[PDB]
Amino acid sequence: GSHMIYSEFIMDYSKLKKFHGKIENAHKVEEGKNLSCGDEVTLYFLFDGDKIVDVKFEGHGCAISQASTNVMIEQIIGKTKQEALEMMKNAENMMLGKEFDENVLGPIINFYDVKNYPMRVKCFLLPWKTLEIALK
Amino acid sequence: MIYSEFIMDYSKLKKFHGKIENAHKVEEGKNLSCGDEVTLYFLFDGDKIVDVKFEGHGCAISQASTNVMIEQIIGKTKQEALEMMKNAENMMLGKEFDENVLGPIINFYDVKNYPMRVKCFLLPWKTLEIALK
Amino acid sequence: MRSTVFSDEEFSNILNDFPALKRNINGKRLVYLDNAASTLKCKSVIEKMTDFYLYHYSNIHRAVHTLASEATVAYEQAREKVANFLNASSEEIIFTSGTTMGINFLVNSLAKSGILKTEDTVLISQVEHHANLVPWVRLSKFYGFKVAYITADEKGVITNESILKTKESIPNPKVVSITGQSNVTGQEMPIELIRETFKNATLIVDGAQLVPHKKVDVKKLDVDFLVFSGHKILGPTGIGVLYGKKALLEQLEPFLYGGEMIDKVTFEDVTFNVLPYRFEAGTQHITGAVGLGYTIDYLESIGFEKVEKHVEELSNYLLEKMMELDFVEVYGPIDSSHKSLVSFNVKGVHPHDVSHILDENFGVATRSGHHCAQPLMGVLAKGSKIDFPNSTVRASVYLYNTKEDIDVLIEGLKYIRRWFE
Amino acid sequence: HMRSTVFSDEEFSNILNDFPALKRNINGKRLVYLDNAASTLKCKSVIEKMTDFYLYHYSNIHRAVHTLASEATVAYEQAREKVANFLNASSEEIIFTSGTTMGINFLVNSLAKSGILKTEDTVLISQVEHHANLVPWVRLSKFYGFKVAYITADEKGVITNESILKTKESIPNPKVVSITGQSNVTGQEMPIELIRETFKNATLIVDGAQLVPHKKVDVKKLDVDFLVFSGHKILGPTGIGVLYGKKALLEQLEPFLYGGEMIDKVTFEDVTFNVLPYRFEAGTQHITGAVGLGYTIDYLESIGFEKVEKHVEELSNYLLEKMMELDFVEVYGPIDSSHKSLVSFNVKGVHPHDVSHILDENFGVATRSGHHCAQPLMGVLAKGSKIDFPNSTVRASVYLYNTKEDIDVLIEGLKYIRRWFE
Numbered sequence A: 001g002s003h004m005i006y007s008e009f010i011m012d013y014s015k016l017k018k019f020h021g022k023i024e025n026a027h028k029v030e031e032g033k034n035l036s037c038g039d040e041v042t043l044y045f046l047f048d049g050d051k052i053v054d055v056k057f058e059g060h061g062c063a064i065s066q067a068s069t070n071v072m073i074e075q076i077i078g079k080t081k082q083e084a085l086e087m088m089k090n091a092e093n094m095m096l097g098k099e100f101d102e103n104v105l106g107p108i109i110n111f112y113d114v115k116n117y118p119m120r121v122k123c124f125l126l127p128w129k130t131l132e133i134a135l136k
Numbered sequence B: 001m002i003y004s005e006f007i008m009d010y011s012k013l014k015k016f017h018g019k020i021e022n023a024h025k026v027e028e029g030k031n032l033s034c035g036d037e038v039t040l041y042f043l044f045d046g047d048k049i050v051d052v053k054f055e056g057h058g059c060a061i062s063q064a065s066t067n068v069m070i071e072q073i074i075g076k077t078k079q080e081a082l083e084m085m086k087n088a089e090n091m092m093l094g095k096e097f098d099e100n101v102l103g104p105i106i107n108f109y110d111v112k113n114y115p116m117r118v119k120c121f122l123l124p125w126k127t128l129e130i131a132l133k
Numbered sequence C: 001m002r003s004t005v006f007s008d009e010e011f012s013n014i015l016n017d018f019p020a021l022k023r024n025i026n027g028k029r030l031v032y033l034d035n036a037a038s039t040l041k042c043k044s045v046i047e048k049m050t051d052f053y054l055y056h057y058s059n060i061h062r063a064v065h066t067l068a069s070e071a072t073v074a075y076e077q078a079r080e081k082v083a084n085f086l087n088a089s090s091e092e093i094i095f096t097s098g099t100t101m102g103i104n105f106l107v108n109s110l111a112k113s114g115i116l117k118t119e120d121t122v123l124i125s126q127v128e129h130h131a132n133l134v135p136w137v138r139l140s141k142f143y144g145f146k147v148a149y150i151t152a153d154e155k156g157v158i159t160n161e162s163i164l165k166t167k168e169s170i171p172n173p174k175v176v177s178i179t180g181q182s183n184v185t186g187q188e189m190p191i192e193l194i195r196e197t198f199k200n201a202t203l204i205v206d207g208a209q210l211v212p213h214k215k216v217d218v219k220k221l222d223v224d225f226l227v228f229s230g231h232k233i234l235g236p237t238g239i240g241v242l243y244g245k246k247a248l249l250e251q252l253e254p255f256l257y258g259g260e261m262i263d264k265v266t267f268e269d270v271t272f273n274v275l276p277y278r279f280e281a282g283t284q285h286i287t288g289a290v291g292l293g294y295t296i297d298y299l300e301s302i303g304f305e306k307v308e309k310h311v312e313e314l315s316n317y318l319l320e321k322m323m324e325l326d327f328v329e330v331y332g333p334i335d336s337s338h339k340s341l342v343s344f345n346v347k348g349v350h351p352h353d354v355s356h357i358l359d360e361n362f363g364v365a366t367r368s369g370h371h372c373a374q375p376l377m378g379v380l381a382k383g384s385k386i387d388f389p390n391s392t393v394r395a396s397v398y399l400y401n402t403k404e405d406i407d408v409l410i411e412g413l414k415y416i417r418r419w420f421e
Numbered sequence D: 001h002m003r004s005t006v007f008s009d010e011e012f013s014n015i016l017n018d019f020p021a022l023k024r025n026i027n028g029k030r031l032v033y034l035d036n037a038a039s040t041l042k043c044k045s046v047i048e049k050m051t052d053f054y055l056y057h058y059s060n061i062h063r064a065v066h067t068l069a070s071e072a073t074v075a076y077e078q079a080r081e082k083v084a085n086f087l088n089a090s091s092e093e094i095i096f097t098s099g100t101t102m103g104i105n106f107l108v109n110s111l112a113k114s115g116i117l118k119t120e121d122t123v124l125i126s127q128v129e130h131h132a133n134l135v136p137w138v139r140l141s142k143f144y145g146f147k148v149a150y151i152t153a154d155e156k157g158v159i160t161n162e163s164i165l166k167t168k169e170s171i172p173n174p175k176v177v178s179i180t181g182q183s184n185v186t187g188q189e190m191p192i193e194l195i196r197e198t199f200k201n202a203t204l205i206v207d208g209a210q211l212v213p214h215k216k217v218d219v220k221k222l223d224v225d226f227l228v229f230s231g232h233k234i235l236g237p238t239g240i241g242v243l244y245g246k247k248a249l250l251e252q253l254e255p256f257l258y259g260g261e262m263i264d265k266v267t268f269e270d271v272t273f274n275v276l277p278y279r280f281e282a283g284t285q286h287i288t289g290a291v292g293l294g295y296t297i298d299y300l301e302s303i304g305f306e307k308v309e310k311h312v313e314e315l316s317n318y319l320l321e322k323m324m325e326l327d328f329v330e331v332y333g334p335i336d337s338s339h340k341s342l343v344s345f346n347v348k349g350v351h352p353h354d355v356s357h358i359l360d361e362n363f364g365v366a367t368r369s370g371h372h373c374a375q376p377l378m379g380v381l382a383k384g385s386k387i388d389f390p391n392s393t394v395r396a397s398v399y400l401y402n403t404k405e406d407i408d409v410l411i412e413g414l415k416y417i418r419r420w421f422e
């Protein structure tokens, strides 16, 4: 229907199940801080050297944080940790209203409008700020 | 206005300044009125107050009120001194009080229209009160 | 309208004192249901603060010039107004920056004074706000006292039975610190039952949620301390109140040190001023105190009894309408102890999304999250029949609210159930 | 024609117009407000934005998604940024408090609870400190076991370069150095660079309460570890103060107060903390005060802060000069370029209370009379006095909206008190 923040892309990726779960015997596991008022992400990675093979997550979340998470995962599968921490910085840059690179982000750009909601930025960033801390 | 002839005279009065060496009760007054200092020194004999001395720097309202308080309690008793101070206190806080007990402590009445000078008047009495448990 | 307490005209004058209510969000009037976090401000009270700031302002207590006098009189008169509001003596009323600071004051000062020592227990409840939980828990590490909990049931309720059974295991807690009313479940607590069950403890009430809508007589309740915040009772921010029994206050080490609270200071030693000044270190929120006084005058001129009843009526209505919803889980008591607010979740919709749509599409303001009671969320989790998001939405009413406001909320929630179907 | 080298008559007139209290009269005489070192008068346009905020954009902050919560959180975080820019700091280094006094208490406790200020360590302060930067250290030394030592002052209350270097010799390695940026009695602006380089390993705390209102402070170039001040002494609202700390030090600190907002994870048994600066703001802060402090900073900046600084310099010099011409007055503090803002003094034969009383009632002039929250410094001044010293002082202090004409009225009043008043 008509909407404001909850765009067709956000609603579609909020309902995605593909990445829901944990990995048994994981090369990394990072719980997100609760800087987002009770949105939770815990990320489970398989690596294979310096690249990123598989990602999964659990946690109760927001339509926006869930969508942000699903899209984040889907764009860092098959990419280097730095070929991912730079998306992260652009993702963040977009959100804080700074210059950023459109092409690096790919379909993450569909979260642009969320920059216009100060109090929903945290929901978008949660998985990204968790992915940052998970890789340092 | 606040500075009547009566108040200025009692501020200057030198009859009660001093320590009493080996006094029965030495009561240092609290900093409840900026740098108005009153340390009261007492001699007793039962309930009578034979002598009272005081030491300290203070403004004219505080020095006058101390000298007047001292005049009106010398030779008078501990118990009546405390009801005299309740009436001096009531006079300032806009309460019922009546003149009888105060005598010429009534000349400080106008001090109540200067809410920040009330402390200056009350310091001696508040210190008489703590001194007479 | 639809009030048993205020006539159409009287109520209408009240709503117009709050300019915030004239605002629109995407075409719809603001429906402010986040009062449990803070309240909108009254024009008359703010105009009086403006006047104070601009024409009668100076620092207080320590000067003899005209403005210092007017401001000192104003401030001390505000203390007297707060005293009369709680039926306390004015020397028992300490101005603070908030409930939070007041509680930190108590923990620190009760420990520094030797009252709350290594071998002692503080009893609090599982439903406490972080301000009456985190200080006790964290400072236990520094001072070594124990922390024990009165337990809540599956819905977050503190029952009488729970209170009595805790008395069996914890017979002599040195301190009991309990909320007068939970900011998540809405439960007004049985303070009289608490006071008599723990007759020997030092009893602290976190009154932040209670005081704004129910008259509190601290002498009759016989509490040892009470704290609350001005911003929850139509007042300025940055101002709170701690009440303490005079005989206890006299025995406490000050929490904060500095100007005003001293008597004599040397380079090596320090003595303290008298009550209450002993507990007010430095320049306080002067204008805040004075505005809290004008706030209380404003409430008393409406009639605090009418405020309390109007809030009771709205809460009962809120509770009735929310209970008719088949797609919602409600937390708390759902009886006559339940006041002011309802925490709930929409089946299959996260609290952030519920509050966002409520706001953006219905102009309805609500909170969504832990409500500064994270451990309570785990208790509610264990009693949830839905997939529990470790958070809830919370709607909360106060004076300027109406039944039509609650109806807009209900409608919103129906729209939201369809949106994520 | 109003005798400023800094402001033109029109722009000066526009500035006085912002301060409605200046239109009060006391018994027929216009308000001459010289009590700025205790607190300042408020600007109408700044107060009106504060009231606009309360009535139209107000709500609690950080933990809700509704329109008013969003607006208020943004306003509040922009106020943090304005204060950050004002001191040349990063906004994560800026902590709102209730005032200077709280900020200092924050630091004594937290430094001790964090294990930076250990038992047997030394805190060095000066003899001219306000009670806010003295009473906490003295009293809490007895709970946490550290020691308190003093950089001594001379007979007129001055802190000389030689006293500082001399104290270095007796106390070479104080864990903490807590010093006033400018004394609220002597007016002396302290040599902070000299103090920082002399005690290069100390945690250096500056009480900026008198300093920040009229002089640019760049926390990076001073290299102070901590700095505190109060909004109400810089035209701002009451109930609001600031604590700047270096990011690296703030990261190491135990929070002072605990509660909502400042936590990350809370259990019944454990707590972890939020990031900076939120870790140090427990509970609802003075939201409208911080926002008002921001608008106050904007107002001063729209005037030009360098102009405020020079205007106060020019008034300071004039007040000092006129006070010095009087044979019946004893003045305290340095007679030099380090003296600003305020003059403490006594009138020969007359208690400060009576001086200040008569200046208000008969000349409309506002001044403080007493200890000025510095009892121990009174004893230092007493030893240098050439009169019957009353253990207190009159204090006249100037700020933005004052004029040389204000000061001449003070002078008239003091000559009147000298002449009459037996």
Ligand SMILES: *Cc1c(COP(=O)(O)O)cnc(C)c1O
Pocket: C036, C037, C098, C099, C100, C101, C129, C131, C132, C179, C181, C182, C183, C206, C208, C209, C229, D260, D283, D284, D285
């Ligand atoms: C709001 C609240 C607090 C804290 O109030 P602050 O003003 O943030 O200090 C504590 N307890 C309860 C029950 C509350 O509702």
Ligand SMILES: *Cc1c(COP(=O)(O)O)cnc(C)c1O
Pocket: C259, C281, C282, C283, C284, D037, D038, D099, D100, D101, D102, D130, D132, D133, D180, D182, D183, D184, D207, D208, D209, D210, D230, D232
């Ligand atoms: C006024 C002052 C303080 C106290 O500030 P508050 O706002 O009262 O906490 C501290 N230090 C100095 C140097 C001052 O002038």
Ligand SMILES: [Zn+2]
Pocket: A036, A039, A061, A062, A063, A064, A065, A122, A123, C352
């Ligand atoms: Zn979210």
Ligand SMILES: [Zn+2]
Pocket: B033, B036, B058, B059, B061, B062, B119, B120, D353
């Ligand atoms: Zn006096």
